[PDB]
PDB file of C-alpha atoms and ligand atoms in Angstrom:
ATOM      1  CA  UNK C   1     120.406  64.871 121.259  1.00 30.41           C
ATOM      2  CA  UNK C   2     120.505  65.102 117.832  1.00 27.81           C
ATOM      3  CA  UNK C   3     119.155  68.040 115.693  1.00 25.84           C
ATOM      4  CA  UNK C   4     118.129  67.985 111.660  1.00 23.37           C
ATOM      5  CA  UNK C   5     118.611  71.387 110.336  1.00 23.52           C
ATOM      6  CA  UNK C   6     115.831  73.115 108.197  1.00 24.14           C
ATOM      7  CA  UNK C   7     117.693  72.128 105.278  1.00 23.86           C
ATOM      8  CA  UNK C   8     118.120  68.386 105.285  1.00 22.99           C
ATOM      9  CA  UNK C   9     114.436  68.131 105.964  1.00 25.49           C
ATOM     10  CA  UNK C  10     113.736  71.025 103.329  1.00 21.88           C
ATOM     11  CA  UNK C  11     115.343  68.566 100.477  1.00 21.32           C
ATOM     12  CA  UNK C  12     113.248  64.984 102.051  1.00 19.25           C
ATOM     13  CA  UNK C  13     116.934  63.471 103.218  1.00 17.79           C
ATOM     14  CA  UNK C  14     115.389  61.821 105.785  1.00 15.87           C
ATOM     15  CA  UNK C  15     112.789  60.481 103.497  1.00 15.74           C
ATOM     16  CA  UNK C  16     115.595  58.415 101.896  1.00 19.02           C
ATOM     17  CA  UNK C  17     117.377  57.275 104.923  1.00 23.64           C
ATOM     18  CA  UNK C  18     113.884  55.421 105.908  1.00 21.92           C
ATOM     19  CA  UNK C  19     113.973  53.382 102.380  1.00 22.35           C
ATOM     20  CA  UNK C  20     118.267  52.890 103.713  1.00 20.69           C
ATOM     21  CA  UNK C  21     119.779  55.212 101.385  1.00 17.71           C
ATOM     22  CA  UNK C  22     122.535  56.772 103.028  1.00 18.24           C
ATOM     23  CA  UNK C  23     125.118  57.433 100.928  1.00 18.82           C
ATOM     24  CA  UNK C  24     127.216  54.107 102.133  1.00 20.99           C
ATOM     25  CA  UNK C  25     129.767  53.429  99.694  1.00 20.08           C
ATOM     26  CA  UNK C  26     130.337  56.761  97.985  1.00 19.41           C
ATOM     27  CA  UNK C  27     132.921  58.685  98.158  1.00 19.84           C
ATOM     28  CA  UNK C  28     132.647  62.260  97.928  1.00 20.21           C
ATOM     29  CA  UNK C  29     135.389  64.607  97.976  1.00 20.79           C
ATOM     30  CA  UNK C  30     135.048  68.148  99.678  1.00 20.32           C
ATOM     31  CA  UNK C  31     137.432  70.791  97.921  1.00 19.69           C
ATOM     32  CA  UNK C  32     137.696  73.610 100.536  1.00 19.96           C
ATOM     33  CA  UNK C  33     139.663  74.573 103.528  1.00 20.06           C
ATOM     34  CA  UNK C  34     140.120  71.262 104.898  1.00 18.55           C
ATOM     35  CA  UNK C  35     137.849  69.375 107.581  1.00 18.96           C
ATOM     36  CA  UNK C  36     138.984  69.063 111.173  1.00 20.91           C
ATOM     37  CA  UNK C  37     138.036  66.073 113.521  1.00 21.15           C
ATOM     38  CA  UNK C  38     135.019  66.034 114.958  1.00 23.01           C
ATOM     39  CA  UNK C  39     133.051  63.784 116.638  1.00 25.59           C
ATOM     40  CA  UNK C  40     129.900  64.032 114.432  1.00 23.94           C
ATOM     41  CA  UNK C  41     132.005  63.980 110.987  1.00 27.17           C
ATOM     42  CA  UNK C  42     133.818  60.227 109.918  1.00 26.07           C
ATOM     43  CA  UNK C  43     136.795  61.448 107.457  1.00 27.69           C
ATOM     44  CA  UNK C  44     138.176  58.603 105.689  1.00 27.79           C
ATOM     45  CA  UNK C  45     141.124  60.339 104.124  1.00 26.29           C
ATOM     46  CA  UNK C  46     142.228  63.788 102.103  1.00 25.71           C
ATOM     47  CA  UNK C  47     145.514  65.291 100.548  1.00 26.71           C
ATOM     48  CA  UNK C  48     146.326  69.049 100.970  1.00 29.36           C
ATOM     49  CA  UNK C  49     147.430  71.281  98.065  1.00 27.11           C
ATOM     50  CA  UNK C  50     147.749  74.253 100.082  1.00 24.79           C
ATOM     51  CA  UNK C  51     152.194  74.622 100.121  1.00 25.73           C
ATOM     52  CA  UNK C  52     152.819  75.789 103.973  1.00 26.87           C
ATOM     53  CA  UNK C  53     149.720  73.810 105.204  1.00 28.98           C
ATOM     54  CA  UNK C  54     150.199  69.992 104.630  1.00 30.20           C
ATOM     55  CA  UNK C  55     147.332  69.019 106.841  1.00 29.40           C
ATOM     56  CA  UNK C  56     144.029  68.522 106.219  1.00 27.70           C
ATOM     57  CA  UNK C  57     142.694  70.148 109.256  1.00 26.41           C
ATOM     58  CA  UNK C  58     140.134  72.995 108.655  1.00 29.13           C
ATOM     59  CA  UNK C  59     141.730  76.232 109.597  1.00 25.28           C
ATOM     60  CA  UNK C  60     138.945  78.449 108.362  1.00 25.50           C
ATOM     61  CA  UNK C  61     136.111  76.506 109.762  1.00 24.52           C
ATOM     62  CA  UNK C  62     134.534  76.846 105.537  1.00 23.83           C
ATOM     63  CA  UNK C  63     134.808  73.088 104.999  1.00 24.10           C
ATOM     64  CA  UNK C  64     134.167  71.261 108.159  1.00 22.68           C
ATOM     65  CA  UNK C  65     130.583  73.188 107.906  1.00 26.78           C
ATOM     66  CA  UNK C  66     130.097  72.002 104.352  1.00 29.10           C
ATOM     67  CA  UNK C  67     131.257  68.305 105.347  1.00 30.83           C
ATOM     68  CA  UNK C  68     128.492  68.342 107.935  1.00 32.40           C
ATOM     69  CA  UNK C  69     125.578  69.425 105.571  1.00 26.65           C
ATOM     70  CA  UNK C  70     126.922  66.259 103.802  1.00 29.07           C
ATOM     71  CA  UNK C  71     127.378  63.728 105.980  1.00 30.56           C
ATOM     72  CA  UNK C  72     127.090  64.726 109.646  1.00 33.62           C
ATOM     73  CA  UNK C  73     127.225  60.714 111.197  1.00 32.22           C
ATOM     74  CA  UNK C  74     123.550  59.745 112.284  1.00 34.97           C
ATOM     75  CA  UNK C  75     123.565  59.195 115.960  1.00 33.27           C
ATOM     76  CA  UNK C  76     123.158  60.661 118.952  1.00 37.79           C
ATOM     77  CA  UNK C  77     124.506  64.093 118.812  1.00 38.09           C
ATOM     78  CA  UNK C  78     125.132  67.067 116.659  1.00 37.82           C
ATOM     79  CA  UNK C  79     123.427  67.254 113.307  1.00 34.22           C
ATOM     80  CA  UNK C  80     122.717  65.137 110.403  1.00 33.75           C
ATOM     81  CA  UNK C  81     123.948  65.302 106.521  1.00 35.26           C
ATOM     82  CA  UNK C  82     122.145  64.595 103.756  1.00 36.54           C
ATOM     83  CA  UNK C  83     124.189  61.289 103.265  1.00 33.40           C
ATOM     84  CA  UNK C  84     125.402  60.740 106.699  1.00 36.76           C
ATOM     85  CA  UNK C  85     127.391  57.213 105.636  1.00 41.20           C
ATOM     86  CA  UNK C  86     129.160  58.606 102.643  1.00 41.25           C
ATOM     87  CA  UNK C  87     133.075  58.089 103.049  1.00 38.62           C
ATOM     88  CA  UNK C  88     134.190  61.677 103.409  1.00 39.37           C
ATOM     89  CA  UNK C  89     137.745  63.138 102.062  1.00 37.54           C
ATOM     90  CA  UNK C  90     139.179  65.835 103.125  1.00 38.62           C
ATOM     91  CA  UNK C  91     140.667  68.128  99.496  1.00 40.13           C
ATOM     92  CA  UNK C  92     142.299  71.503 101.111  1.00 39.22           C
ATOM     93  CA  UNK C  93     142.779  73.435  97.955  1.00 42.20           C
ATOM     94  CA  UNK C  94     141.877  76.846 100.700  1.00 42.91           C
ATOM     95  CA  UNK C  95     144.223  77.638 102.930  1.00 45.93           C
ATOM     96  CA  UNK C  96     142.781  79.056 106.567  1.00 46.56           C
ATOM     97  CA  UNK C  97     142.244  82.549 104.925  1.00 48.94           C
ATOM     98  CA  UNK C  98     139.344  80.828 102.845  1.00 49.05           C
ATOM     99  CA  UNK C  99     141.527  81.532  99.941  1.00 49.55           C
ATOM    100  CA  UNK C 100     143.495  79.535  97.379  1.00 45.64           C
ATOM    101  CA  UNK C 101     145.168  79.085  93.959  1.00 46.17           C
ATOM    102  CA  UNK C 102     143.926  77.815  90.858  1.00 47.30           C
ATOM    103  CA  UNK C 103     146.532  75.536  90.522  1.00 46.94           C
ATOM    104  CA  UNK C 104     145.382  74.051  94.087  1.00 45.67           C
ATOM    105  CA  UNK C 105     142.226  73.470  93.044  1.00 43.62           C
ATOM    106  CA  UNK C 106     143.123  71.889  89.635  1.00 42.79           C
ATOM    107  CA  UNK C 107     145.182  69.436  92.105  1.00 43.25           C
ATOM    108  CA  UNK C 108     142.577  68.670  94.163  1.00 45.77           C
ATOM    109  CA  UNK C 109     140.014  67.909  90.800  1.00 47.25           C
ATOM    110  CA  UNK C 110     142.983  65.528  89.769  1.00 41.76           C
ATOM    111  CA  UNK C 111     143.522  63.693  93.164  1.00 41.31           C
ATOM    112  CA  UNK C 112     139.715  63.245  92.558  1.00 41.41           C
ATOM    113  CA  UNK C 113     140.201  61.765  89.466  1.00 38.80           C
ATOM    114  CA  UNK C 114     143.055  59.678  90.530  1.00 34.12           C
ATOM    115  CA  UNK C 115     141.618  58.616  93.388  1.00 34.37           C
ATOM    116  CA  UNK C 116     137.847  57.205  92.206  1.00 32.27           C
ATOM    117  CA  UNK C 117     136.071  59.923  94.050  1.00 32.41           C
ATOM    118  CA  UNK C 118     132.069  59.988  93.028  1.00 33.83           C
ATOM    119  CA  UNK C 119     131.067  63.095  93.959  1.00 29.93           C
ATOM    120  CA  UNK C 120     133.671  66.290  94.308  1.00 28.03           C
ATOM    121  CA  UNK C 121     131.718  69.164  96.263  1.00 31.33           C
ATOM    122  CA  UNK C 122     133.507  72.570  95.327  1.00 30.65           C
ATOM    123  CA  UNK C 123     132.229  75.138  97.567  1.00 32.09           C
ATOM    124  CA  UNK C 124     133.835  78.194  96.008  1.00 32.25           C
ATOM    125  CA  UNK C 125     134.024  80.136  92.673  1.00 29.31           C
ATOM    126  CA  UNK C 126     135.512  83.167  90.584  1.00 28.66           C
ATOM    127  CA  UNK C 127     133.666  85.910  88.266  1.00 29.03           C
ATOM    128  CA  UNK C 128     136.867  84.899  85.913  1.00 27.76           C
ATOM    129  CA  UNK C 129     137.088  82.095  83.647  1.00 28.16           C
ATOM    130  CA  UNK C 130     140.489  79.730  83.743  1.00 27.40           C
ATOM    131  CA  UNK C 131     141.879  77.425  81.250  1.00 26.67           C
ATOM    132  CA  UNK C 132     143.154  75.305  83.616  1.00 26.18           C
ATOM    133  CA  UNK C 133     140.523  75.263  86.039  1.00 24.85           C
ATOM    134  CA  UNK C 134     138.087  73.774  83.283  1.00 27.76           C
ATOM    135  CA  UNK C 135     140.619  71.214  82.387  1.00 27.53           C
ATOM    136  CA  UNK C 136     141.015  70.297  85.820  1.00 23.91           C
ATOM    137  CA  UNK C 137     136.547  69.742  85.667  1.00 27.19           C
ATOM    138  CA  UNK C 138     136.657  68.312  82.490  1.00 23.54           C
ATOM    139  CA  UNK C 139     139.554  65.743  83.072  1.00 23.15           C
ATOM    140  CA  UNK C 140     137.477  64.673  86.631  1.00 23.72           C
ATOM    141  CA  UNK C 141     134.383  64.255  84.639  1.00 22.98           C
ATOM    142  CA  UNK C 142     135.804  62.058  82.047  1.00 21.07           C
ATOM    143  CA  UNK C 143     137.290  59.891  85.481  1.00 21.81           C
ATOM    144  CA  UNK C 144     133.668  59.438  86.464  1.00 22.13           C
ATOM    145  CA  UNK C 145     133.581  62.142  89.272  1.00 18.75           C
ATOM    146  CA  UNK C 146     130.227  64.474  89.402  1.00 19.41           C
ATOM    147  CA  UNK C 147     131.423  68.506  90.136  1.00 19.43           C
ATOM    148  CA  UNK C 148     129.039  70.191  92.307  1.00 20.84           C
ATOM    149  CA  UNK C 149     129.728  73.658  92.822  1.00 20.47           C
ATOM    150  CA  UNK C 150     127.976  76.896  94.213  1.00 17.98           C
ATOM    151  CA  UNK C 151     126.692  79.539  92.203  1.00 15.29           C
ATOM    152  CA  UNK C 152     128.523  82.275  93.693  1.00 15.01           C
ATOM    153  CA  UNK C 153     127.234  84.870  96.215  1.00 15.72           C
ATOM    154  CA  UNK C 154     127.453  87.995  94.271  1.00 15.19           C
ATOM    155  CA  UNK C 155     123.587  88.102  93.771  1.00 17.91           C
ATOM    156  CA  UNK C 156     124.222  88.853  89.755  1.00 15.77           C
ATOM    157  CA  UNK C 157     122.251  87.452  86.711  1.00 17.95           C
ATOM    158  CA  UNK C 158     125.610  85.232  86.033  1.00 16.51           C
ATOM    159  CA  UNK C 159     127.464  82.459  87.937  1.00 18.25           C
ATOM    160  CA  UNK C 160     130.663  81.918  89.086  1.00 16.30           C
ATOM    161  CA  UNK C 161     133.759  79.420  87.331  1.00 15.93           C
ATOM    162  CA  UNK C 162     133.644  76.940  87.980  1.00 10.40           C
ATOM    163  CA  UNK C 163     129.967  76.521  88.245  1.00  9.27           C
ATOM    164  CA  UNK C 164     129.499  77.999  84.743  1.00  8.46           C
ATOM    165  CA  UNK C 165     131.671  75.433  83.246  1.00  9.58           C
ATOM    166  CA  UNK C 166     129.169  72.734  81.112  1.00  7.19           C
ATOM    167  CA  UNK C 167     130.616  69.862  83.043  1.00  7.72           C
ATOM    168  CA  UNK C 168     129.616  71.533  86.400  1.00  7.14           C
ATOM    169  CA  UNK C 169     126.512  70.716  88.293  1.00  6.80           C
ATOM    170  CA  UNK C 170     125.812  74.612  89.435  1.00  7.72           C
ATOM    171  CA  UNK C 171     124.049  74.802  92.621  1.00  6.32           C
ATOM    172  CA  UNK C 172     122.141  77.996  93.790  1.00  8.97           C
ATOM    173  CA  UNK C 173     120.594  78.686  97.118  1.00  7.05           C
ATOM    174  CA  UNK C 174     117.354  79.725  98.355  1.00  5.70           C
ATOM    175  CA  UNK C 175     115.595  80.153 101.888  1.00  2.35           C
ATOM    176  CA  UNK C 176     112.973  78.936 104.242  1.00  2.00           C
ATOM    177  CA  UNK C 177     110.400  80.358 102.180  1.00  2.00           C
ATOM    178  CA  UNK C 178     111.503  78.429  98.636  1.00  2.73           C
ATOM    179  CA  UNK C 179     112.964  81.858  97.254  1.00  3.52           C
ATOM    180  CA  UNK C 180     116.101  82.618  95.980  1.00  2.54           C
ATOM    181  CA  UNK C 181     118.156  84.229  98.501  1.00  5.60           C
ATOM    182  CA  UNK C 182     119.269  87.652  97.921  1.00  5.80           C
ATOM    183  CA  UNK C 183     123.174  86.630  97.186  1.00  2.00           C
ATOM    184  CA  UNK C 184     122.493  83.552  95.039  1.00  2.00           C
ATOM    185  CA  UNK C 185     124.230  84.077  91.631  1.00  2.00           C
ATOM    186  CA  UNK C 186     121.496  83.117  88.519  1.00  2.00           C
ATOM    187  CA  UNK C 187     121.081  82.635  84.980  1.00  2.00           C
ATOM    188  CA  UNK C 188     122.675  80.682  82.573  1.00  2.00           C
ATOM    189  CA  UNK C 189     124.065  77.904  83.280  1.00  6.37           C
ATOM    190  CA  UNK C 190     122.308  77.108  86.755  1.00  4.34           C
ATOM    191  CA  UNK C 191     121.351  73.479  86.971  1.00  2.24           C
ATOM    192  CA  UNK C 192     119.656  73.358  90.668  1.00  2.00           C
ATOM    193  CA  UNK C 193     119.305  75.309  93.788  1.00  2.00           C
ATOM    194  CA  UNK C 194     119.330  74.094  97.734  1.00  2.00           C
ATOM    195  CA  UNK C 195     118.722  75.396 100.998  1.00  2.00           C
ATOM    196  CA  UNK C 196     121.341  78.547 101.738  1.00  2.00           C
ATOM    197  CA  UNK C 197     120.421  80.332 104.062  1.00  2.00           C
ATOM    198  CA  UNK C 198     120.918  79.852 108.220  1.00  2.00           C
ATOM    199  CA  UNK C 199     122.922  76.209 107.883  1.00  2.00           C
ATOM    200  CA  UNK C 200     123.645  75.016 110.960  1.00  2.00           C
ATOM    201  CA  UNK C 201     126.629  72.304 110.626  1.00  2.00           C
ATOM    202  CA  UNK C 202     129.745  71.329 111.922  1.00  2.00           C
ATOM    203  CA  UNK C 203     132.721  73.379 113.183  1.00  2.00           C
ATOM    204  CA  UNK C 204     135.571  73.036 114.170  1.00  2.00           C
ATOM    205  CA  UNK C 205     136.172  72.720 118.078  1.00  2.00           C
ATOM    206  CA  UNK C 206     133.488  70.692 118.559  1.00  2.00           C
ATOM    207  CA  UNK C 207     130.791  72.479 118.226  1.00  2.00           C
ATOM    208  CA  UNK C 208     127.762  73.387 115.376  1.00  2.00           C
ATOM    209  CA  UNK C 209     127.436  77.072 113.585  1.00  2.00           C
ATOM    210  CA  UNK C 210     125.156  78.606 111.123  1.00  2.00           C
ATOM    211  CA  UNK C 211     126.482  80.086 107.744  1.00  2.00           C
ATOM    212  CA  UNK C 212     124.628  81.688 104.647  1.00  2.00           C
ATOM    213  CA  UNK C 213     125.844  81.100 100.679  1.00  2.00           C
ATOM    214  CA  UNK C 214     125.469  79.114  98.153  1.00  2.00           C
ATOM    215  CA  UNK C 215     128.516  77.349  99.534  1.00  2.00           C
ATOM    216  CA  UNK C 216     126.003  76.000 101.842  1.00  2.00           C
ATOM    217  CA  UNK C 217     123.624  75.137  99.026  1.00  2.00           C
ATOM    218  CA  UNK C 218     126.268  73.036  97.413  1.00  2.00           C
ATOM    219  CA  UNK C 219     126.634  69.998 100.188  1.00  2.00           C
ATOM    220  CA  UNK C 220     122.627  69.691  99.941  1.00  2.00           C
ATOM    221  CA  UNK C 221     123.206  68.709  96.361  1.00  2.00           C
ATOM    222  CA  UNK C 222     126.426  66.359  96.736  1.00  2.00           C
ATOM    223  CA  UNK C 223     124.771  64.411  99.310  1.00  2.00           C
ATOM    224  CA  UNK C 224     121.792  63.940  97.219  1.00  2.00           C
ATOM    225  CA  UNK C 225     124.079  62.674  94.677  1.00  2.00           C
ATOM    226  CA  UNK C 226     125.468  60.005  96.907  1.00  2.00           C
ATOM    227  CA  UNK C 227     122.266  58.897  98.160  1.00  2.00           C
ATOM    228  CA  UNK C 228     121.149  58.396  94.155  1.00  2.00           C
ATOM    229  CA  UNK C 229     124.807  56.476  93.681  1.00  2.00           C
ATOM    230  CA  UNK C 230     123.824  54.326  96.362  1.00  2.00           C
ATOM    231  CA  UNK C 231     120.237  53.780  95.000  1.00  2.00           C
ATOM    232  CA  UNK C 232     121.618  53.131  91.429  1.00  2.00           C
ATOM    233  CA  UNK C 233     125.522  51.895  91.141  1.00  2.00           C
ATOM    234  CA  UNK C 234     125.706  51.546  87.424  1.00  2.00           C
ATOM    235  CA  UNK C 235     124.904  55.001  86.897  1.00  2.00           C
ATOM    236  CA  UNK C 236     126.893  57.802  85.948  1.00  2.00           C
ATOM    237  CA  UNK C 237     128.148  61.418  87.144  1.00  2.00           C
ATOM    238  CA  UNK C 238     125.774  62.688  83.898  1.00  2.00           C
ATOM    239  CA  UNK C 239     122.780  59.792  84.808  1.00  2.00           C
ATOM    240  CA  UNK C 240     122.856  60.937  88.268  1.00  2.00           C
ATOM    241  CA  UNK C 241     123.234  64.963  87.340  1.00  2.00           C
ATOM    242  CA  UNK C 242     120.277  64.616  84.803  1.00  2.00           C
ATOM    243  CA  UNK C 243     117.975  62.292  87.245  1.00  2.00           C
ATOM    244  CA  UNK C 244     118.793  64.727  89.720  1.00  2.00           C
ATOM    245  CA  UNK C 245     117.090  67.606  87.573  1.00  2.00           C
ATOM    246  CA  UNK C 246     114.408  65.712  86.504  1.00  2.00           C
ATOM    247  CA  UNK C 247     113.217  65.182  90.226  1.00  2.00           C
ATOM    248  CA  UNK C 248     113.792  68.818  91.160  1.00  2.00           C
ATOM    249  CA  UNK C 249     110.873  70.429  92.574  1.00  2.00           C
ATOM    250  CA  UNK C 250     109.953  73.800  90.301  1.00  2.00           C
ATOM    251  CA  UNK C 251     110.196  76.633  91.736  1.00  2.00           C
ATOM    252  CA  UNK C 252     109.329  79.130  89.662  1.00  2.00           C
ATOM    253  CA  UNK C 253     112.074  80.674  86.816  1.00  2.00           C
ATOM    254  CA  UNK C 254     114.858  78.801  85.172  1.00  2.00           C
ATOM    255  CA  UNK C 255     117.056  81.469  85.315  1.00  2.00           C
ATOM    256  CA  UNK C 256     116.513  82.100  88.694  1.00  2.00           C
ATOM    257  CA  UNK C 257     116.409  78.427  90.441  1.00  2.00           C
ATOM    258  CA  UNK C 258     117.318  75.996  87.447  1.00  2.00           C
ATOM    259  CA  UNK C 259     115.088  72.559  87.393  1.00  2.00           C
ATOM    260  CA  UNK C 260     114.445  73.746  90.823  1.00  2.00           C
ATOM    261  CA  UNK C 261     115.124  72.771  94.210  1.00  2.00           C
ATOM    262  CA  UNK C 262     116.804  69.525  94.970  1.00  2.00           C
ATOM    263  CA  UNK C 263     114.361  66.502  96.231  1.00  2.00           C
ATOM    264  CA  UNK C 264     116.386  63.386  98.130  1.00  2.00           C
ATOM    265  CA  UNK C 265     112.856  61.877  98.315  1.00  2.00           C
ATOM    266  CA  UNK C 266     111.788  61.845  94.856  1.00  2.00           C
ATOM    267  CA  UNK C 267     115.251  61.471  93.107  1.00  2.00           C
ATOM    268  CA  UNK C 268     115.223  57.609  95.492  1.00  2.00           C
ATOM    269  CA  UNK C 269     112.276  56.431  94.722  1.00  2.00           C
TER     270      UNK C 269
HETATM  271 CA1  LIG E 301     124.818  63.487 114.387  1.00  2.00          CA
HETATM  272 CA1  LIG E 302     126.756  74.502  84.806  1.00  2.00          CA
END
């Protein structure tokens, strides 16, 4: 049987898989620790630019649950993403430790680039600000590709690099309730939150697991931007970003939530 988390019904997904928006025929590139095989996850490809790890297999278990939120496969078992039929690729710029280099994740914004990616979901984030790491988001965004990344998890009135960065779709997190959780980072530069809090997704070994973070928050919000690619083609990483924003549901403060949380429903229609 299969289950939809609180989340994916929390931002309407289903909603937009009834009009047959899916996601089909965007590709959306997750830059984490790699995503193992599973048999509710379709991975169409990847690169790893982790040295002394040259798979793309999830040794952390970080990115496998964030490939889930976005496109767990509707059938039959497990869970479902927000864009279950986007083609999924696997960026490991984290090596098992959940841990990686700048350099690694400038390499896996480039392969995005390089590769016509549409959506590149970046999971992670620093307090410090680095020149190449916002050359690395600004040379993707000029190739078309839409950054998502989380807020950070520090639970401070400031957000995490890359997420601060202008060409950076920051994502914050809030809970069942349609508060900010605790942990999500705030303030300027915060475009959107997304459900954080108790995600149940993929995992590796086969099975389904429940994290906190805006990490989590982050998928919600690429898979909302496939589903929008699907609906409108012609449309840009900064069309799609914007429309996204304008459809937000309010939630109260723009310092603390953004344009507010993420709606799949209205941003289709
Ligand atoms: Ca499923
Ligand atoms: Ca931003």
């Amino acid at each position: 049987a299969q289950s939809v988390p609180w989340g994916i019904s929390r931002v309407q997904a289903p909603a937009a898989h009834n009009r047959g928006l899916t996601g089909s025929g965007v590709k959306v590139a997750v830059l984490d620790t790699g995503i193992s095989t599973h048999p509710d996850l379709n991975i169409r490809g990847g690169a790893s630019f982790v040295p002394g790890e040259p798979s793309t297999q999830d040794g952390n278990g970080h990115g496998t649950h964030v490939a889930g939120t976005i496109a767990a496969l509707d059938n039959s078992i497990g869970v479902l993403g927000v864009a279950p039929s986007a083609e999924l690729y696997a960026v490991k710029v984290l090596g098992a430790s959940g841990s990686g280099a700048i350099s690694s994740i400038a390499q896996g914004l480039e392969w995005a680039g390089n590769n016509g990616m549409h959506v590149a979901n970046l999971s992670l984030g620093s307090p410090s600000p680095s020149a190449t790491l916002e050359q690395a988001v600004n040379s993707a965004t000029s190739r078309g590709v839409l950054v998502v990344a989380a807020s950070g998890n520090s639970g401070a009135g400031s957000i995490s690099y890359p997420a601060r960065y202008a060409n950076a779709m920051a994502v914050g997190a809030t809970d069942q309730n349609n508060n900010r959780a605790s942990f999500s980072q705030y303030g300027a530069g915060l475009d959107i939150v997304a459900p954080g809090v108790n995600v149940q997704s993929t995992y590796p070994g086969s099975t389904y697991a429940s994290l906190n973070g805006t990490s989590m928050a982050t998928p919600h919000v690429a898979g909302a931007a496939a589903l929008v690619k699907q609906k409108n083609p012609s449309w840009s990483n900064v069309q799609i970003r914007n429309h996204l924003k304008n459809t937000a549901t309010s939630l109260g403060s723009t310092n603390l939530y953004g344009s507010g949380l993420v709606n799949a429903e209205a941003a289709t229609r």
